[PDB]
């Protein structure tokens, strides 16, 4: 209806502002991977562990290319 | 002690300190290293916080 | 001769050195003051044995 459409706008706004914070901090993420990491941090997860996981998967992506 | 800066009053030689910046990801120490000269007293009315931040911008260049 | 003695020597020398590490390392977190480490750890001796606990989590 209407309240199911206002929430989609309010999520698109935040997912743009977080992308701006991500580009001024020069994180290598893009718009699609950031939506996975924001979803993960919603439920409650260690950023010290998830950041180590990303810092290793991007570290092992290069040995295969 | 190696240069002639040691031939000075021991007050102003003590007040100058190495300031560490906040730590950057992959970089060298030549981009993050600056002196701070720290000031505490009635002299801080002339050398306020606005002065030392602008001095650190000069040391940055 | 050595079965009773050197067995007591190595277990004491390992226990001495470990508590000597823990004295230096727990005094190294204290940033005059930090010089008690660098006096004990003079010119290259035992100033770099273990970096930190190789762990995570």
């Amino acid at each position: 209806a209407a309240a199911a459409a206002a929430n989609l706008n309010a999520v698109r706004e935040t997912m743009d502002v977080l992308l701006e914070i991500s580009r001024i901090l020069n994180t290598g993420l893009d718009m699609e991977t950031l939506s996975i990491c924001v979803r993960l941090c919603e439920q409650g997860i260690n950023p010290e562990a998830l950041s180590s996981v990303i810092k290793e998967l991007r570290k092992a992506t290069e040995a295969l290319k | 002690r190696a240069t002639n800066a040691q031939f000075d009053s021991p007050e102003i030689l003590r007040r100058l300190d190495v300031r560490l910046l906040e730590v950057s990801p992959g970089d060298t120490g030549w981009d993050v290293f600056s002196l701070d000269y720290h000031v505490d007293g009635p002299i801080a009315t002339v050398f306020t916080r606005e002065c030392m931040s602008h001095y650190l911008r000069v040391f940055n260049f | 001769l050595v079965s009773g003695f050197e067995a007591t020597i190595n277990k004491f020398d390992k226990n001495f050195s470990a508590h000597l590490l823990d004295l230096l390392a727990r005094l190294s977190i204290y940033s005059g003051m930090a010089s008690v480490i660098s006096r004990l750890d003079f010119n290259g001796f035992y100033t770099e044995r273990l970096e930190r606990l190789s762990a995570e989590r």
């Binding site: 901090l25 950041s51 | 950057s24 | 989590r57």
Partner: protein, 107 residues
Amino acid sequence: KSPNVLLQNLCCRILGRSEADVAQQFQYAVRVIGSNFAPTVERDEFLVAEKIKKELIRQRREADAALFSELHRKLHSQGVLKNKWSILYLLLSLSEDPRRQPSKVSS
């Protein structure tokens, strides 16, 4: 969704592959993420905010350190974010210094 199926989407976002292809890296990611799930430090957004302001102040980018102050308040203005500490702690850790070229987008 669940976090176990959601980690595999991340393994297919970073590595460009399908779930039937990449399974050695996902086995590593379950090893790291599992047994390290619970928060180990106390949560506050205030300390992570004053560390990102520091992060932008001495990259000679004193302008973005005051723009982050206006972007961090909007996250509270909307209110769809429960754990604001975790995402900021994550976005600070993956940050890189460009050293230069802060080619400013917006708008």
